[PDB]
Design an enzyme around this catalytic site. Structure first.
Site, PDB file in Angstrom:
ATOM      1  N   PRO A  46       0.826  -1.215   0.000  1.00  0.00           N
ATOM      2  CA  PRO A  46       0.000   0.000   0.000  1.00  0.00           C
ATOM      3  C   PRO A  46       0.856   1.258   0.000  1.00  0.00           C
ATOM      4  O   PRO A  46       1.828   1.370   0.749  1.00  0.00           O
ATOM      5  CB  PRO A  46      -0.817  -0.128   1.291  1.00  0.00           C
ATOM      6  CG  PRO A  46      -0.780  -1.586   1.628  1.00  0.00           C
ATOM      7  CD  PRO A  46       0.562  -2.064   1.172  1.00  0.00           C
TER       8      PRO A  46
ATOM      9  N   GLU B 223      -3.761   5.190   5.100  1.00  0.00           N
ATOM     10  CA  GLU B 223      -3.321   5.830   3.863  1.00  0.00           C
ATOM     11  C   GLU B 223      -4.115   7.100   3.572  1.00  0.00           C
ATOM     12  O   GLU B 223      -3.573   8.068   3.020  1.00  0.00           O
ATOM     13  CB  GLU B 223      -3.433   4.850   2.695  1.00  0.00           C
ATOM     14  CG  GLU B 223      -2.710   3.529   2.917  1.00  0.00           C
ATOM     15  CD  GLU B 223      -1.203   3.652   2.808  1.00  0.00           C
ATOM     16  OE1 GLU B 223      -0.717   4.719   2.377  1.00  0.00           O
ATOM     17  OE2 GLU B 223      -0.501   2.679   3.154  1.00  0.00           O
TER      18      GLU B 223
ATOM     19  N   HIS C 284      16.854  -1.336   5.534  1.00  0.00           N
ATOM     20  CA  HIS C 284      17.161   0.084   5.664  1.00  0.00           C
ATOM     21  C   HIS C 284      18.664   0.323   5.723  1.00  0.00           C
ATOM     22  O   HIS C 284      19.172   1.278   5.122  1.00  0.00           O
ATOM     23  CB  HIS C 284      16.475   0.655   6.904  1.00  0.00           C
ATOM     24  CG  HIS C 284      14.984   0.710   6.793  1.00  0.00           C
ATOM     25  ND1 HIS C 284      14.197  -0.421   6.770  1.00  0.00           N
ATOM     26  CD2 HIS C 284      14.135   1.760   6.697  1.00  0.00           C
ATOM     27  CE1 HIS C 284      12.928  -0.070   6.665  1.00  0.00           C
ATOM     28  NE2 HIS C 284      12.863   1.248   6.619  1.00  0.00           N
TER      29      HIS C 284
HETATM   30  C1  LIG Z   1      15.596  15.560  -2.130  1.00  0.00           C
HETATM   31  O1  LIG Z   1      16.282  14.442  -2.557  1.00  0.00           O
HETATM   32  C2  LIG Z   1      15.995  13.327  -1.700  1.00  0.00           C
HETATM   33  C3  LIG Z   1      16.814  12.165  -2.210  1.00  0.00           C
HETATM   34  O2  LIG Z   1      18.066  12.088  -1.546  1.00  0.00           O
HETATM   35  C4  LIG Z   1      14.493  13.009  -1.640  1.00  0.00           C
HETATM   36  O3  LIG Z   1      14.322  12.259  -0.442  1.00  0.00           O
HETATM   37  C5  LIG Z   1      13.353  11.208  -0.611  1.00  0.00           C
HETATM   38  O4  LIG Z   1      12.086  11.664  -0.142  1.00  0.00           O
HETATM   39  C6  LIG Z   1      11.028  10.712  -0.321  1.00  0.00           C
HETATM   40  C7  LIG Z   1       9.768  11.375   0.178  1.00  0.00           C
HETATM   41  O5  LIG Z   1       9.747  11.394   1.599  1.00  0.00           O
HETATM   42  C8  LIG Z   1      11.340   9.427   0.438  1.00  0.00           C
HETATM   43  O6  LIG Z   1      10.326   8.484   0.113  1.00  0.00           O
HETATM   44  C9  LIG Z   1      10.026   7.694   1.273  1.00  0.00           C
HETATM   45  O7  LIG Z   1      10.671   6.449   1.123  1.00  0.00           O
HETATM   46  C10 LIG Z   1      10.417   5.513   2.155  1.00  0.00           C
HETATM   47  C11 LIG Z   1      11.289   4.303   1.884  1.00  0.00           C
HETATM   48  O8  LIG Z   1      10.442   3.171   1.746  1.00  0.00           O
HETATM   49  C12 LIG Z   1      11.130   2.150   0.994  1.00  0.00           C
HETATM   50  O9  LIG Z   1      10.631   0.867   1.339  1.00  0.00           O
HETATM   51  C13 LIG Z   1       9.248   0.627   1.006  1.00  0.00           C
HETATM   52  C14 LIG Z   1       8.889  -0.755   1.517  1.00  0.00           C
HETATM   53  O10 LIG Z   1       8.891  -0.719   2.941  1.00  0.00           O
HETATM   54  C15 LIG Z   1       9.073   0.764  -0.510  1.00  0.00           C
HETATM   55  O11 LIG Z   1       7.713   0.547  -0.850  1.00  0.00           O
HETATM   56  C16 LIG Z   1       9.505   2.168  -0.950  1.00  0.00           C
HETATM   57  O12 LIG Z   1       9.339   2.313  -2.356  1.00  0.00           O
HETATM   58  C17 LIG Z   1      10.942   2.460  -0.518  1.00  0.00           C
HETATM   59  O13 LIG Z   1      11.764   1.617  -1.326  1.00  0.00           O
HETATM   60  C18 LIG Z   1       8.926   5.186   2.116  1.00  0.00           C
HETATM   61  O14 LIG Z   1       8.633   4.230   3.118  1.00  0.00           O
HETATM   62  C19 LIG Z   1       8.108   6.461   2.350  1.00  0.00           C
HETATM   63  O15 LIG Z   1       6.721   6.163   2.261  1.00  0.00           O
HETATM   64  C20 LIG Z   1       6.078   6.516   3.503  1.00  0.00           C
HETATM   65  O16 LIG Z   1       4.959   7.347   3.256  1.00  0.00           O
HETATM   66  C21 LIG Z   1       3.906   6.737   2.486  1.00  0.00           C
HETATM   67  C22 LIG Z   1       2.856   7.796   2.225  1.00  0.00           C
HETATM   68  O17 LIG Z   1       3.379   8.710   1.267  1.00  0.00           O
HETATM   69  C23 LIG Z   1       3.365   5.538   3.268  1.00  0.00           C
HETATM   70  O18 LIG Z   1       2.319   4.927   2.532  1.00  0.00           O
HETATM   71  C24 LIG Z   1       4.500   4.533   3.499  1.00  0.00           C
HETATM   72  O19 LIG Z   1       4.015   3.401   4.213  1.00  0.00           O
HETATM   73  C25 LIG Z   1       5.676   5.196   4.219  1.00  0.00           C
HETATM   74  O20 LIG Z   1       5.219   5.443   5.549  1.00  0.00           O
HETATM   75  C26 LIG Z   1       8.497   7.568   1.370  1.00  0.00           C
HETATM   76  O21 LIG Z   1       7.953   7.209   0.111  1.00  0.00           O
HETATM   77  C27 LIG Z   1      12.710   8.884   0.054  1.00  0.00           C
HETATM   78  O22 LIG Z   1      13.072   7.796   0.899  1.00  0.00           O
HETATM   79  C28 LIG Z   1      13.774   9.967   0.176  1.00  0.00           C
HETATM   80  N1  LIG Z   1      15.056   9.462  -0.283  1.00  0.00           N
HETATM   81  C29 LIG Z   1      16.022   9.066   0.549  1.00  0.00           C
HETATM   82  C30 LIG Z   1      17.276   8.563  -0.097  1.00  0.00           C
HETATM   83  O23 LIG Z   1      15.894   9.122   1.768  1.00  0.00           O
HETATM   84  C31 LIG Z   1      13.584  14.238  -1.588  1.00  0.00           C
HETATM   85  O24 LIG Z   1      12.267  13.893  -2.002  1.00  0.00           O
HETATM   86  C32 LIG Z   1      14.127  15.389  -2.438  1.00  0.00           C
HETATM   87  N2  LIG Z   1      13.386  16.610  -2.174  1.00  0.00           N
HETATM   88  C33 LIG Z   1      12.776  17.339  -3.120  1.00  0.00           C
HETATM   89  C34 LIG Z   1      12.900  16.842  -4.530  1.00  0.00           C
HETATM   90  O25 LIG Z   1      12.158  18.365  -2.847  1.00  0.00           O
END
Ligand SMILES: *[C@@H]1O[C@H](CO)[C@@H](O[C@@H]2O[C@H](CO)[C@@H](O[C@@H]3O[C@H](CO[C@H]4O[C@H](CO)[C@@H](O)[C@H](O)[C@@H]4O)[C@@H](O)[C@H](O[C@H]4O[C@H](CO)[C@@H](O)[C@H](O)[C@@H]4O)[C@@H]3O)[C@H](O)[C@H]2NC(C)=O)[C@H](O)[C@H]1NC(C)=O
Ligand SMILES: *[C@@H]1O[C@H](CO)[C@@H](O[C@@H]2O[C@H](CO)[C@@H](O[C@@H]3O[C@H](CO)[C@@H](O)[C@H](O)[C@@H]3O)[C@H](O)[C@H]2NC(C)=O)[C@H](O)[C@H]1NC(C)=O
Ligand SMILES: *[C@@H]1O[C@H](CO)[C@@H](O[C@@H]2O[C@H](CO)[C@@H](O)[C@H](O)[C@H]2NC(C)=O)[C@H](O)[C@H]1NC(C)=O
Ligand SMILES: *[C@@H]1O[C@H](CO)[C@@H](O[C@@H]2O[C@H](CO)[C@@H](O)[C@H](O)[C@H]2NC(C)=O)[C@H](O)[C@H]1NC(C)=O
Ligand SMILES: *[C@@H]1O[C@H](CO)[C@@H](O)[C@H](O)[C@H]1NC(C)=O
Ligand SMILES: *[C@@H]1O[C@H](CO)[C@@H](O)[C@H](O)[C@H]1NC(C)=O
Ligand SMILES: *[C@@H]1O[C@H](CO)[C@@H](O)[C@H](O)[C@H]1NC(C)=O
Lengths: 195, 596
Positions: B328, B357, B487
């Site tokens: 999800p 969600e 992680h």
């Molecule tokens: C600046 O550049 C950085 C890159 O360095 C960007 O940072 C990223 O930001 C996003 C947005 O927060 C991060 O995305 C998060 O990733 C988490 C990692 O989850 C991993 O594992 C799950 C399985 O458990 C996979 O499904 C997933 O695809 C990943 O591989 C997610 O867990 C987060 O989701 C959370 O929120 C959602 C709701 O939106 C919930 O449904 C989820 O359950 C969870 O709680 C989230 O998607 C990303 O990790 C960041 N990168 C790094 C390296 O940390 C910035 O976005 C960028 N800034 C800008 C462009 O302004």
């Protein structure tokens, strides 16, 4: 009643150009029937300022002007007297005593493609404000730094015109909307446009 | 004119360009995630390459404007974000090596497979069978074999890669103005430029340690009770005063203790709160569940979904040739397009996940008016806390009766309440020491205090010390146990969960007090109140413009994290645990080693 003032050309035109270069049409020497406007789809905003909508056929003026252009969904509220904001003070400025009605209806099905739309531009930078009822088409590099731009882009040198983007999946407030503005006025001349 | 206006114009142009590019990239990603084809893979690759490039040139161009000439305190924030998240200071060879190391680590973790014991006939994967074995299988030998084999075969390959990776990351951090990668990670919570709300990167460690010192007794009592129950389960292996064996925690690494509920149920004879049969009888479906969630969201006064969300969001498993990832997620493609991806079944777990969600979706919608660089949560914990508070509130028997799934004749008492509290505790309380230990060890290794030859010795020493878990089999420095975690292997921060655990309970107490609630905190419903929703929306709409300390003050009247709400929430279980721990000595012994 022979010379009906034809409004199904200013409406129903399949092309409304860009807001930064808006068309102007002068209507005169005909019988005007405003009932044909209500024959289209439900209008997003039907606002009349100086005249009661029910009495449009009971009063008449020397000339009527029609302007048409396409803007975004959430900048419709800016096409009104006294409003302040990018589109209103840089592309189409209305006067305080404006007398007429503002027409706006959605055209998402007609003015959007999945690939993207880049034929609807609007102005983003300008040296000074716009006087009411003014049009600008000049395309020059908007200099922002002390060093002269020399007619090239780069550091502190940006193009003034920037284009929209329209896809069918956009949410409400970013979908294209078609706007038509009707204006009424007076001067020392016979009216001759009503019936 | 002035540097402020010259930067404002640049930000104005970047704001418009970034929205379009991000929308294209997000659309490509959603298309692949809903449709797994090589063409979609190529489309995602192209969109991501374009987005990353554009960010690179924008960050490079943004270096012309010094920060000391700006006093809006908002243009400064946007420029700092652009610079930080787009600047690279590494050489081409070092960058290529780092990217190759990351890709190799991800590929190894994804494709790592273990084979059946003393047999080359069959080899198994982590998710399909190993997780099920660790969750359900009660075989001591089988669990020990799986644990040892998996950890060895994943860590022995990735240890030198981890050494090179930490070397490269330390070099990059020292090239930047931060002291090290630990400081780079901890810089997220830093707040500067404001009087009465400033935060320092070093204060986070002290605050976390203080909170853990305050939270220890509840964890130790729960550990004593779980040790007694596990002794009742497995007689011979467990020691009266020693640490629990690591392979008998009900999962691969010990992150969660949910799987031990069947063994550690306090009062099994009482009926459990389950509504799956009721939903089956009433013939519910995914659309009905989502409409119920939307109605609950409306009841507090928040706006509800648009037509595009219903038209585009997929809420059912496609099946047939169409295969998609069923984890999800809440998608924010921007430009007013919000979608939810989830394979839904008729279960209470999915019913709660719908609310979980939908909370994230509402939070994403709240700050739509903010600029592109500010359309994000205050920090890494606020988003998760907002997502989790609604799931906390949606599990109440009062809400279940109001919806109609629960029978009105149901009654609540001692044993129902204690069972619910223990079930919640086994999921919430257990993970906190593990998270704190993992973050502390990563901070220490990034600082350089723990040498490579003593990494494992220190790791198992604090394993015996803090969490009170002892390794079943001795390991030398060849293994890399921490790299076995997703992680850790994929370079993600880990203190967000620790912050969220406190933030969610602070928010819940604030909302319950605002709604004029009385009685125990664990029976609280906010569905019909319209003031708690107003306060929550007032906090949501801010975005990143205001400091998180200011937002927390606006919500709960405090400028720092606290554990008193959590202690108040879990006090009824704490008293019963104190009563039940009369004849059991509280505390583990580090000298005990199960392997003689
Ligand atoms: C600046 O550049 C950085 C890159 O360095 C960007 O940072 C990223 O930001 C996003 C947005 O927060 C991060 O995305 C998060 O990733 C988490 C990692 O989850 C991993 O594992 C799950 C399985 O458990 C996979 O499904 C997933 O695809 C990943 O591989 C997610 O867990 C987060 O989701 C959370 O929120 C959602 C709701 O939106 C919930 O449904 C989820 O359950 C969870 O709680 C989230 O998607 C990303 O990790 C960041 N990168 C790094 C390296 O940390 C910035 O976005 C960028 N800034 C800008 C462009 O302004
Ligand atoms: C820092 O810079 C920002 C960006 O300009 C300043 O925010 C701006 O504040 C003014 C006055 O509050 C806003 O003007 C308003 O515009 C709306 C139309 O958008 C109009 O209807 C109102 O009547 C009013 O004139 C302006 O919009 C706003 N700009 C943005 C992008 O939000 C801010 O004030 C500056 N801070 C300091 C301390 O100088
Ligand atoms: C899932 O993906 C496949 C392949 O990408 C899609 O099939 C493509 O459909 C488009 C337009 O419908 C065609 O232009 C392509 O030629 C098709 N490719 C192939 C290999 O058949 C399919 O339509 C997608 N499914 C959905 C529901 O979008
Ligand atoms: C919020 O208000 C609604 C409607 O006013 C309540 O819904 C009723 O709940 C009772 C149970 O207390 C049911 O017997 C009714 O059938 C429900 N009516 C409707 C129209 O849903 C709801 O209970 C209130 N919320 C709380 C927490 O009391
Ligand atoms: C304009 O009107 C004609 C006939 O009245 C119709 O065929 C055509 O589809 C219309 N086009 C638009 C864009 O409304
Ligand atoms: C919620 O959606 C319903 C339609 O499903 C609509 O009638 C209602 O007005 C919406 N809520 C609000 C606050 O607009
Ligand atoms: C159960 O509730 C009764 C109510 O009178 C109380 O006397 C008893 O102590 C309770 N037991 C526990 C374990 O809380």
């Amino acid at each position: 009643i022979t010379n009906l003032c034809p409004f199904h050309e200013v409406f129903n035109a399949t092309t409304f150009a860009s807001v930064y270069a808006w068309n102007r049409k002068r209507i005169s020497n005909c019988v005007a029937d405003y009932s044909v406007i209500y024959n289209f789809a439900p209008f997003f905003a039907f606002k009349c300022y100086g005249v009661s909508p029910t009495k449009l056929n009971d009063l008449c003026f020397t000339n009527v002007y029609a302007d048409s252009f396409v803007i975004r969904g959430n900048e419709v509220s800016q096409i009104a007297p006294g409003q302040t904001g990018n589109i209103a003070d840089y592309n189409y400025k209305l006067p305080d005593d404006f007398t007429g009605c503002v027409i706006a209806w959605n055209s998402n099905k007609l003015d959007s493609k999945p690939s993207g739309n880049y034929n609807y531009l609007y102005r983003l930078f300008r040296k000074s404000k716009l006087k009411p009822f003014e049009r600008d088409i000049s395309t020059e590099i908007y200099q922002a730094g002390n060093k002269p731009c020399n007619g090239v882009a780069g550091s502190n040198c940006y193009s003034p015109l920037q284009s929209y983007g329209f896809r069918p999946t956009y949410g409400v407030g970013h979908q294209p909307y078609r706007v038509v503005v009707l204006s009424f006025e007076l001067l020392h001349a016979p009216a001759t446009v009503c019936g | 004119s002035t540097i402020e206006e010259q930067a404002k114009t640049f930000l104005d142009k970047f704001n418009h360009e970034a929205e379009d590019l991000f929308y294209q990239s997000s659309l490509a990603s959603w298309n692949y995630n809903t449709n797994i084809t090589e063409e979609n893979v190529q489309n995602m690759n192209n969109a991501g390459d374009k987005w990353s490039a554009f960010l690179k040139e924008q960050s490079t161009l943004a270096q012309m404007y010094p920060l000391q000439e700006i006093q809006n305190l908002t243009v400064k924030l946007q420029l700092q974000a652009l610079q930080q998240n787009g600047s690279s200071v590494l050489s081409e060879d070092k960058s290529k090596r780092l990217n190759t190391i990351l890709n190799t680590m991800s590929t190894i973790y994804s494709t790592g497979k273990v084979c059946n014991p003393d047999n080359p006939q069959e080899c198994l994967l982590l998710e399909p069978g190993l997780n099920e074995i660790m969750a359900n299988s009660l075989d001591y030998n089988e669990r020990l074999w799986a644990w040892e084999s998996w950890r060895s075969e994943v860590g022995k390959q990735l240890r030198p890669l981890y050494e090179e990776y930490v070397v490269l990351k330390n070099e990059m951090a020292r090239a930047n103005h931060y002291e090290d990668y630990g400081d780079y990670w901890r810089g997220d919570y830093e707040v500067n430029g404001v009087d009465g709300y400033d935060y320092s990167r070093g204060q986070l460690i002290e605050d976390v340690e203080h909170t853990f010192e305050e939270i220890k007794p509840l964890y130790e009592h729960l550990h004593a009770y779980v040790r007694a129950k596990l002794m009742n389960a497995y007689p011979s292996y467990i020691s009266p005063i020693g640490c629990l064996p690591a392979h008998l925690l009900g999962d691969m690494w010990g992150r969660f203790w949910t799987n031990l509920y069947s063994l550690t149920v306090p009062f099994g004879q009482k009926p459990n709160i389950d509504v799956t049969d009721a939903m089956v009888d009433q013939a519910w479906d995914a659309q009905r569940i989502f409409k119920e969630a939307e109605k609950f969201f409306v009841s507090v006064g928040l706006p509800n979904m648009t037509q595009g969300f219903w038209e585009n969001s997929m809420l059912t498993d496609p099946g047939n040739v169409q295969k998609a990832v069923c984890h999800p997620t809440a998608w924010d493609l921007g430009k007013g397009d919000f979608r939810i991806l989830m394979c839904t079944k008729v279960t209470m777990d999915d019913f709660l996940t719908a609310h979980h969600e939908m909370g994230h979706i509402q939070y994403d919608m709240a700050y739509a008016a903010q600029p592109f660089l500010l359309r994000n949560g205050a920090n890494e914990g606020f988003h998760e806390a907002v997502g989790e508070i609604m799931s906390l509130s949606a599990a109440t028997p009062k809400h279940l009766k109001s919806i109609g799934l629960l029978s009105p004749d149901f009654q609540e008492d001692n044993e129902t309440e204690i069972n619910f509290l223990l079930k919640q505790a086994l999921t919430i309380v257990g993970t906190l020491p593990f998270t704190y230990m993992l973050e502390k060890w990563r901070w220490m290794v990034f600082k350089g205090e723990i040498p490579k030859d003593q990494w494992m010795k220190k790791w198992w020493e604090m394993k015996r010390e803090i969490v009170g878990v002892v390794e079943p089999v001795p390991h030398d420095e060849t293994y890399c146990d921490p790299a076995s975690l997703f992680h850790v292997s994929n370079d993600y921060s880990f203190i967000r969960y620790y912050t969220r655990t406190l933030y969610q309970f602070q928010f819940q107490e604030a909302l319950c007090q605002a709604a004029k609630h009385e009685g125990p905190l664990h029976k609280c419903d906010i569905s019909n109140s319209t003031e708690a929703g107003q306060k929550l929306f007032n906090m949501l709409r801010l975005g990143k413009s205001e400091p998180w300390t200011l937002a927390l003050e606006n919500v709960v009247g405090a400028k720092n994290m606290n554990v008193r709400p959590l202690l108040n929430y879990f006090e009824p279980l704490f008293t019963w645990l104190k009563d039940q721990n009369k004849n059991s000595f509280v505390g583990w012994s580090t000298d005990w080693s199960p392997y003689a």
